Swiss-Prot record, chain A:
Residues annotated for Zn(2+) binding in this entry: 18, 21, 33, 36
The protein's name in its UniProt record: Large ribosomal subunit protein eL37A
Source species taxonomy: Eukaryota, Metazoa, Ecdysozoa, Arthropoda, Hexapoda
Residues in C4-type zinc fingers: 18-36
Keyword Ribonucleoprotein: yes
From Swiss-Prot, chain B:
Source organism, top-level taxon: Eukaryota
Keywords: Ribonucleoprotein, Ribosomal protein
Protein name listed in UniProt: Large ribosomal subunit protein eL15
Keyword Ribosomal protein: yes
Gene: RpL15
Gene Ontology cellular-component annotations: cytosolic large ribosomal subunit; cytosolic ribosome
Family from the record: Belongs to the eukaryotic ribosomal protein eL15 family.
Region feature (Disordered): 116-135
Curated annotation (Swiss-Prot), chain E:
Protein name per its UniProtKB record: Large ribosomal subunit protein uL4
Family stated for the protein in its record: Belongs to the universal ribosomal protein uL4 family.
UniProtKB/Swiss-Prot annotation, chain F:
HAMAP family: Ribosomal_eL39
MF terms (GO), sorted A to Z: structural constituent of ribosome
Domain of life assignment: Eukaryota
Keyword Phosphoprotein on entry: no
Descriptive protein name: Large ribosomal subunit protein eL39
Coiled-coil blocks: none
UniProtKB keywords: Ribonucleoprotein, Ribosomal protein
Similarity-based family: Belongs to the eukaryotic ribosomal protein eL39 family.
Organism expressing this protein natively: Drosophila melanogaster (Fruit fly)
Length: 87, 135, 131, 61, 196, 50
RNA sequence: GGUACAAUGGUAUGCGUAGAAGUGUUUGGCGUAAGCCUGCAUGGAGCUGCCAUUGGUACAGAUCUUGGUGGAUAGUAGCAAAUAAUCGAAUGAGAGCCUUGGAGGACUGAAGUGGAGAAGGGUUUCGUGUGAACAGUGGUUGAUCACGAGUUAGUCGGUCCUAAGUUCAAGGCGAAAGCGAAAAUUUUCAAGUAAAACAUAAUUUUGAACGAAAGGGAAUACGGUUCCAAUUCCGUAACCUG
RNA sequence: UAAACUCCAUCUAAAACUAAAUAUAACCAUGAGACCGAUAGUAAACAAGUACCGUGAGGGAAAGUUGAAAAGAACUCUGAA
RNA sequence: UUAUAUACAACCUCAACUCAUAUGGGACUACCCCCUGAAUUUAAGCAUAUUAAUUAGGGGAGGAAAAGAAACUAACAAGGAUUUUCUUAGUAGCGGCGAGCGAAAAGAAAACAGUUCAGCACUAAGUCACUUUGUCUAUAUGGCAAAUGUGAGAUGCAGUG
RNA sequence: AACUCUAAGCGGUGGAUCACUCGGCUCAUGGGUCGAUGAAGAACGCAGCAAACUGUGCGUCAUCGUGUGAACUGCAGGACACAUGAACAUCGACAUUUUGAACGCAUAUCGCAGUCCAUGCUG
RNA sequence: UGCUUGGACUACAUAUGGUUGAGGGUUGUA
């Protein structure tokens, strides 16, 4: 009974969702995400897995601020003025 | 020295690897001293450090540290170099006088192989394998 | 050709015009003027519009009859002209799309802006023939 | 923007304007020695500056 | 003039795939690990696998360029000027020259001042050089590659070469004619003087 | 479970609205390639792991 | 030495929507041979001979790799545990099912196959519609598919309290990360005042927080109501907290 | 080449700043190529780090092509279709 | 002051604040600096060696970084900060002297740019930060002056060097 | 016209071959720009009809100002809002939800506060 | 006062000032 019979006892969760990364990999008794290592100020990533880094790098999501800063660089980071009309 | 933090289930390897209790750091106690101040005080730059006493388990040091956003460190052009951004955490990069010595930086012959800079800049050069176009 | 910021790559030229936005796609939507409007305005081509009159040159409709356009359907790189048409199976008149390179503008719709292109595309022909 | 342009009229002439009526350039650029003293100089270097300028010359026979 | 090519250095090797060994009734190659995705457990890393690395990947440090002795590139330039006389040898690169006056064709320095392509083709018309340009237009084709997708679809074959001394206007004026190219005396490319 | 949290009920709600088909005008747009929905789940064949 | 494949440089005043590559073939051939040329048929936009230089350059095998397929086999594989259905009717294109309703024989036999919950699941619930696929037979039905809807609280729970324990707080330590520390660290580290006098004055340091939908812990019951919700809506009668 | 003598040369450690030539699988914008041509080239030409699997760390596909133009087969007959 | 019985002061060491003003964490990964540090492998075994002062782990920056104006070479007829390339050179050396490993000066290039402190018979704190008030003209962590208002400063600020 | 053998023709099954290529890869060039002024990332919302992707943040497939100067389109609906400007780019204005280094305390909770200013119901 | 609603604020470590202070830590006029 290592197999079929033992697997019906799976009804408690080892990992709920995670409050930084949104993956269901926050261990509840550890209180530690297995992915981003959440309650720890600094993200968890490693050089022995580049595929995992690839999956949550800058520009895997939205980049809601960075690519306004790229568009503002090319104009010399100008502020407080607007395009006067003509022509 | 540095007890090697292997788990008392000690170092697995070949017998040159087995040393635990007689090894020394590569950075000195004064190096590691102002390192421990630059972390805990991230809002200030470490300039230089200095021995003031010691006995048998604790050497200890003063550390001259500088509030780089003050309106008198920045407005005064002699000290004003370290208010720049290549001086953010210099003591964590080997750039104060104490961290500098561990690196092995000098002229000429005896201080040879860190000759491009770092020590690792020199292994990169000495092992650099130039395939040429015209070759 | 002599500019190093100009690509002769098949790839980058096909990509930069199928992915052209719909205001670069107006200048890509261009048609030659008639030899009387080429002679009246000193303007060779023009971006096509809606109420412009137009004659079809190449392809099955082949033209001597001028009709006006009703859609500059820039999304397909195609125009629809008022009597260039076709039937469904069930007798609905469908417009057949013609590319503007294979069409000939014989009467331009003019307002304050389509006139000012003519006083800009023609002024820059005497200023490019006197070189 | 009829009300932020009005606050920018009041927080003229005051030092310590709000952080929003204050020039978000980049974090690195806002800190990095405002050039009014990044290129101010010691009195020893202003005195080496005013006695031997780079002369303007040409060489051949 | 060649450029470097190579496959990516990490291609075929982006898999954590080890070998089921024996005796699992399937051959001993590195098979992809997990489950539920068509890709396990499928075959990785090999030249014979589908998605593996190629047999020995191409590297960017092939010797592409070459050192020729300088005296041996002077030998070849000289043997491409002594063959640009000899009308048995210009007549065997194609090259319509049965109305060309002399071998070598020397023309005035007044050709070095030709400033428009209209003037330039009359010079080639008047000197009976235009019959080799007309053979250039009849050779305009498309390549039968593969080169068509790699930016060399095509234009023609080669024509005359106008060695000049000074350039008052003639490299602009001869620029647009197919097959024609203009070259200085002191440089003299061998790649242009014995093409192919 | 019939006692859930507010945060599992909103992630369960979003996967519920995302379980529509493709509207059939979408296959009438020009040069369209979307045929079916490729991110349809059944509740009984693929589980959500939430 | 010769032959297949792909390229690059030259070359053939080469070939091609009057049909290129490819494929098919009892068209006719050539070559010792690898292979080649040719007709016709399909095909619809590109390709070949020569000189040089090449290269990811030639497959029957690797329990090779990916994909597809054949027998075995339309089957003596099989679809046989949990007793069992039958009559007639209606619907329908078609009915043994689940489709329905009627009658009837049976089983579970209440330690249930009955009625409710906790995990878990996540719309599966419900009404109407339904066509393929799915329900290893069928299907007019469906936990399928389309559309529309549905979950109501001061009293039921959570939330509050702590347990076992956990996370952090600078004694500390460590190159650091961080202790797979448990810090118990820590000058007044905590309280107190219808708040005072020759210190205002009496007192306390284990900081802090999390951790129980089964422990502790304020207050509600009935009758009615829906296609779908009810200690929640409706009516009625109470109760707790401030 | 260790040591002791007597020289000679040579620098001035135990504080500090400093452009340029140099590096660059990343980012912003470009140009190229004797590269690959959908079992190839990135794993990904496509709603691809997707679908999906694993408690988790992680594993991770397949899938491009009507025609020049939808002109995307009105209508009739047969059928429950 | 101080029989710890009235104050008063001033320092020095240390507190506290939702005080005024500010500063710092986190991200990326190609290059860069500081650390920590393997084993597969090869030596036809294997422990030193090798792999490698490298994969992995940790920390810190910039458009480059580090280095850098001699406690350097040489032994010359002498050269003259750093860094990069060529050569030196697979050399001198190092090594179960086995496997293997392995630089530098000079020479030739690219580029060139030099300096500042502490410490003396500087010989009137000759300096600085705030804050307020005049008053310039960015939407100024600015400009000048006034009060020299409050502080830093004689346990040493400026200038010279 | 049993079955079998072999050949071709026709139909199937299958998706090779060839020809395509808004994609990869490799080389080079120019440039130097994240974040406590809340980054990267996450989550959920947002369209007349939309699930994904793409875009965005209750001002929610957009956005001031500019540029250009008539579309957008699958279908409606309006464009009298060129002729005082569609759709696109561009972007300097305003803005940016819950989060997140994440900052009142927590968080398998949309849980519990404090201090303060206002309004909305007594007086 | 009274419940709701909206807004500003309330993390930590640090620098410089400000402000309140502790200490039979050195001292001083009495």
């Amino acid at each position: 009974t290592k197999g079929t019979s033992s697997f019906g006892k799976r009804h408690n969760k080892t990992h709920t969702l995670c409050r930084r990364c949104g993956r269901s990999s926050y261990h509840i008794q550890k209180s530690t995400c297995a992915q981003c290592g959440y309650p720890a100020a600094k993200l968890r990533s490693y050089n022995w897995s580049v595929k995992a880094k690839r999956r949550k790098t800058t520009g895997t999501g939205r980049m809601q601020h960075l690519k306004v800063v790229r568009r503002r660089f090319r104009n010399g980071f100008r502020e407080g003025t607007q395009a006067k009309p003509k022509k | 020295g540095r007890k090697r933090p292997v788990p008392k289930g000690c170092t697995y390897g070949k017998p040159k690897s087995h040393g635990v209790n007689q090894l020394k750091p590569y950075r000195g106690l004064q190096s590691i001293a102002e390192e421990r101040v630059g972390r805990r005080l991230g809002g200030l730059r470490v300039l230089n450090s200095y021995w003031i006493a010691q006995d048998a388990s604790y050497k200890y040091f003063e550390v001259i540290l500088i509030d780089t956003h003050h309106s008198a460190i920045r407005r005064d052009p002699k000290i004003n170099w370290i208010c720049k951004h290549v001086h953010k955490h210099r003591e964590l990069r080997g750039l104060t006088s104490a961290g500098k010595s561990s690196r092995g930086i000098g002229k000429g012959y005896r201080y040879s192989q860190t000759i491009g800079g770092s020590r690792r800049a020199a292994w990169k050069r000495k092992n650099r394998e130039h395939m040429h176009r015209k070759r | 050709k002599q500019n190093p910021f100009v690509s002769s790559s098949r790839r980058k030229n096909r990509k930069r015009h199928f992915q052209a936005p719909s205001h670069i796609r107006r200048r890509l939507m261009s048609a030659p003027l008639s030899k009387e409007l080429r002679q009246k305005y000193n303007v060779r081509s023009m971006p096509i519009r809606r109420d412009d009159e137009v004659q079809v040159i190449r392809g099955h409709f082949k033209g001597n009859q001028v009709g006006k356009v009703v859609q500059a359907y820039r999304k397909k790189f195609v125009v629809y002209v008022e009597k260039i048409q076709r039937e469904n199976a069930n007798g609905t008149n469908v417009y057949v799309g013609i590319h503007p390179s294979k069409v000939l503008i014989v009467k331009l719709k003019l307002d304050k802006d389509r006139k000012a292109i003519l006083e800009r595309r023609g002024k820059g022909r005497l200023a490019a023939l006197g070189k | 923007q009829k009300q932020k342009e009005n606050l920018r009229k009041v927080f003229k002439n005051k030092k310590y304007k709000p952080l929003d009526l204050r020039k978000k350039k980049t974090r690195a650029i806002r800190k990095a020695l405002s050039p009014r003293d990044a290129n101010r100089k010691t009195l020893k270097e202003i005195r080496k500056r005013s006695v031997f300028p780079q002369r303007k010359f040409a060489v051949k026979a | 003039n060649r450029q470097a090519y190579a496959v990516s250095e990490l291609a075929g090797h982006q898999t954590s795939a080890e070998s089921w060994g024996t005796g699992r009734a399937v051959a001993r190659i590195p098979r992809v690990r997990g489950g539920g995705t068509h890709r396990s457990g499928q075959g990785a890393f090999g030249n014979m696998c589908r998605g593996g690395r190629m047999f020995a990947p191409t590297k960017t440090f092939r010797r592409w360029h070459r050192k020729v002795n300088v005296n041996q590139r002077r030998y070849a330039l000289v043997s491409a000027i002594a063959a640009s006389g000899v009308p048995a040898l210009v007549q065997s690169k194609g090259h319509v020259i049965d109305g060309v006056s002399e071998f070598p064709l020397v023309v005035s320095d007044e050709v070095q001042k030709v400033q428009k392509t209209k003037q330039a083709v009359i010079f080639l018309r008047r000197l009976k050089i235009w019959a080799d340009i007309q053979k250039v237009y009849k050779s305009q084709r498309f390549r039968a590659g593969r080169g068509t997708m790699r930016d060399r679809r095509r234009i023609a074959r080669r024509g005359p070469l106008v060695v000049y001394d000074k350039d008052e206007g003639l490299r602009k004026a001869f620029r647009n004619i197919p097959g024609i190219e203009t070259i200085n005396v002191d440089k003299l490319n061998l790649l242009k003087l014995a093409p192919g | 479970a019939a006692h859930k949290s507010f945060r599992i009920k909103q992630k369960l709600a979003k996967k519920l609205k995302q379980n529509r088909s493709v509207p059939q005008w979408v296959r009438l747009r020009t040069g369209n390639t979307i045929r079916y929905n490729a991110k349809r789940r059944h509740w009984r064949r693929t589980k959500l792991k939430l």
